[PDB]
Symmetry: D2
């Protein structure tokens, strides 16, 4: 059932800015994000760790908060002006959503902020005010071989992609790429504000769940180094999928799992989307180059596993099951199909994955 376009104007969203993840063991989480991945500590105490990427000047891109159940607490977007926080509040109130306004913020280093339970059940934050910190972009004395340089995007699991897509377009996101079939089903959509391929994305599945948070590197070798280091630390079992080249987005990528199974993507070298008529690319769901351009198989956990999200009271949001077709099932499941070249039987896969594999 369609989400109506408010009469109230949408807040002017700049970009994704930070995520707040609830973690069960703060020290174990710190080891992963600081010792393994090299993120920079803006502040920490016994309850939280505030982390930022190499080129960031706002206070943080990730807040790790100790709690009893691992989950997304907030995905936060920065808006253009202080007045845009009021616009966000009016907009979501018109949508009939639950909102909470804190003039001095929900986390350290953020000022006036609005959190909402959005129409898809996700906890979004909108803020302008943030404490500036030392921008480390030329601190090559600190630069890691695997350095994470920016926060790039979020990716959300939701059962009805077109419903969510309309809502995000009304909010001002522009769809850059999607995955559909020839029977009218949408499996995934990518959408932006900042002029990269995306600031968030929708992946079809049971939800609301958080699929991943993505950080950028400068170069491909930086992503390779993360893999290599994970090998050396004998934690290659925490490499979920990749490294690879995406079809959708054209970015070089890697998916890894934190200690609470929150999925983190490392990402580089997508393209510019800032023109308002940026061409929107649709891939067919059976195209075996759409997710991994090299045709490597998508690991099944990528389609089945994702993080819980919290409501504004701190309780886990109920999951609504997807009724639309499953991307897993139609591509790599027993009745699935994929191709390398459209219309060619040679290099096609029937009821299994590419490269000689089946689902475990």
């Amino acid at each position: 059932n369609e989400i109506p376009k408010p009469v109230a104007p949408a807040p002017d969203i700049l970009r994704c800015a930070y995520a707040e993840l609830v973690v069960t063991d703060l020290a174990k989480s710190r080891n992963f994000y600081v010792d393994v991945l090299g993120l920079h500590v803006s502040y920490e105490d016994e309850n939280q760790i505030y982390l930022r990427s190499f080129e960031e000047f706002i206070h943080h891109n990730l807040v790790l908060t100790k709690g009893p159940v691992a989950a997304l607490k907030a995905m936060a977007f920065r808006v253009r002006t202080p007045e845009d926080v009021d616009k966000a509040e009016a907009y979501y109130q018109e949508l009939g959503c639950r909102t909470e306004r804190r003039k001095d913020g929900f986390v350290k280093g953020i000022g006036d902020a609005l959190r909402v339970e959005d129409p898809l059940g996700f906890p979004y934050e909108f803020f302008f005010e943030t404490t500036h910190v030392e921008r480390l972009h030329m601190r090559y004395d600190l630069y890691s071989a695997g350095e994470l340089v920016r926060l790039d995007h979020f990716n959300q699991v939701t059962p009805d992609v077109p419903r969510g897509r309309k809502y995000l377009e009304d909010l001002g996101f522009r769809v850059t790429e999607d995955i559909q079939d020839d029977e009218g089903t949408t499996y995934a959509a990518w959408m932006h504000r900042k002029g990269t391929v995306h600031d968030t994305a929708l992946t079809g599945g049971n939800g609301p769940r958080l699929h991943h948070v993505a950080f950028s590197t400068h170069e491909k070798h930086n992503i390779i180094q993360i893999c290599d280091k994970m090998g050396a630390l004998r934690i290659s079992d925490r490499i979920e999928r990749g490294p690879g080249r995406h079809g959708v987005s054209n970015a070089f990528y890697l998916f890894i799992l934190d200690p609470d199974n929150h999925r983190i993507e490392i990402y580089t070298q997508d393209y510019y989307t800032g023109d308002p008529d940026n061409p929107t690319i649709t891939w067919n769901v059976h195209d075996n180059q759409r997710r991994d351009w090299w045709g490597n198989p998508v690991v099944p956990s990528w389609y089945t596993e994702a993080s819980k999200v919290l409501d504004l009271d701190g309780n886990v949001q109920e999951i609504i099951e997807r009724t639309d077709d499953s991307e897993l099932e139609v591509t790599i499941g027993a009745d699935g199909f994929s191709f390398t070249r459209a219309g060619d039987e040679d290099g096609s896969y029937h009821g299994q994955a590419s490269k000689g594999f089946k689902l475990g």
Copy 2:
């Protein structure tokens, strides 16, 4: 067991070229020249002679049109002309069939000896070769995926220790191997030129040629080969990778030519030229040994390999391996692998890593 001859081994410098029989020369040319960017030293209607960016000898790869795709010769360069005579005396003492051609078997090679070696492989030894323009600074020709050197061969043979002892007597030094706790050897790597290997033995039914490997300068050059194959919509010919190897520590990719000959692209292994270079043995169940990142080894990697020819041009009969199968003990229904030895977390039983089983 293969006895050590009284005759001295020829002094082998390095792997130098492979001669592959291909069924459609134009389709093979597309792959090796248009897709992969190797440089043409000579061609006609019957053969294409190719070399890498930094090579000064005539060629690293000869593609010969023939009825059955197969390895025709894997050639090693020896230090002096007199080493070809040593090779002949050596293989005659071993009781092997040999053929000597004072003017070579292929263009751009002079005095050469071909043998059917004790493992059934067609080896060539030569010194004399026609020098060509070394293209190492020809950056006007340099491809984003440029192949810069020939690095090694990899051979499938059923009894790895038997082959390893023979290659050690021939002067190759083992650098790395894969074994299990119960004393089975699955693979060994061995060198002359001071890299991890010039050839390698992979346990399996043989003789078959597993692959020929070329080097790039950097990891991004290997990524570009993958990217290009996607753009050409031939990603189905990317067999396995890209990855980081455990054994050798090299960044790698395996692709398949039009006759299913497997080619590896490889970079950034380490120096092995000291005579006490430490050997490294990996456990077969270690899921970081072949792909350091734990990505699963695709089953075709263990099962598929190229036929090899005898000196009459006929396919060599295959002898079955009786020792344990690396595929079966790691990714088969009764196999297992680990991330950390002794840890059930991050271990895989009856299937491959990353959530896959065999198709």
Copy 3:
């Protein structure tokens, strides 16, 4: 004298989009831009060559036009909507500037367009409508080892940097970085619309002249390959300066010269500037890490040579001499000075360039 701020609203400028350069020998220029640099031909005839970068979807990023005197004919910015071309016309008419509007464009592949002789003497174009072409961003079968992936910026030589800066700020560009001294002189300023360090920049000098046009690559090795290729072609004398790391912008860079001496920069890996409170950075003109972070000397031609620009009648604009202090003279001239560490005599240079050189 100060350029007034119009009452009329500024057009919403998206980004730098293309340059039109006049060249004297179209075949020799084609060899440089297509055969040496690998740019992609959108259209060509006996009078013009239209070129685009690897990731571009608009018709072109560079038009080479045969003519009698090598010069910049137009520096074009894309605007957000067709209505913004009307806004640009009103804005420049209010400024008292010569304008010319053509509903079907000045070059192939551009529609309704406004060209102006701006207050600094530069031929600016504003357009929205453009012919979309095949985006080559995943055409790795065409990808060069030195592939140019995007148009990044222009750089303009103008005698009075503060005067120009105020004008560009009123027009909506946001200053990201600048170079000044302790006596109130501004030597250069960088300013953006699209969320990178810049879309254009002002370099103090006799003007109007065009200093350079810059294209991006994905990675640093792509820039090194251009150098290597130019060595193999035995045209290393056309490598003007670099490769290096910039202080200002933090980008990896190279400056080369086309057959008519137009300067082309290759550039990669600057940072995100899209937030409205993006911190500005001011460098001192005597800081020897400001232009080349590694302290390599700035070649003197970089300060003295730049391209002629045309007015709307196709005639070369008269050059007005800078009276403010010269960056060349105050840093590497006979009475100049530069430092490695502020206040440290060790690693400072008096009356000469860094690394043991004087001016030839």
Copy 4:
């Protein structure tokens, strides 16, 4: 004749360059350069010495820093194939009439039976086989730096008569891969190898004996860029002497930097294979402006004039003999010099100055 005659005694079989011992004046400041800035790995340290190795090394060290009163090269060490090659080295240099010192338990920690010699060009060479093996760090990506130095690649020596030194090194088994000459018959520089890269040592024409540099490898070109970027961030870009660049000779990507005592260190990657015995030898003309930097960037004058003192076996600085052959600096970038981009083309040539608009400071 000045020739160094070939001994009748067989040459030791030399594997490769292995380590250098450098005397430094302030051990803590040197440690901060080699460990904290460059990321070399500690094999042993005390208040007098620091022993360091590269990422892929299995022998005990590639560099020994020894506190002393005068910064200088104390020894440039080559590993030999077998224990018996140390005896061969001793007999070889004794036949040449050189001062030798044999220590059956080594001169530095982690090296066993070793011979040091004052060689015929005045350099302190060491030959050894026995060395303490350590953990090879080649897969320790948890320790890998963005600028990681992976191997010791070569030494480079300044000596006044390049042909005289070249013949001596060839007799010792080094093979020349590249050199720089002019049409008048002067040799300015030569590169020579044992291990199958472009070189293990090299001769640069100039006043000597002096040590021009010690060179370490990286995996990739971005690793070298990172060293530069890090030195900028540390505000020690004045210690970047020359580069980064692409060499003509060797085809390697390179950078030259200066340690706290002004010992020059090169970072180097991606030269080519030279192991075949008929490896084609490449001669460049001294006036070719692409021979040293392929992109035609000018060679910094200090690169031609400055180099490190070397010690004799008593720890005293070796007397320096002046070059009488033509100077590479003078004939290329000096007042009466010249260079070209294209041979025979005045366009892209430089006369009485360097390339890119620069004169000598």
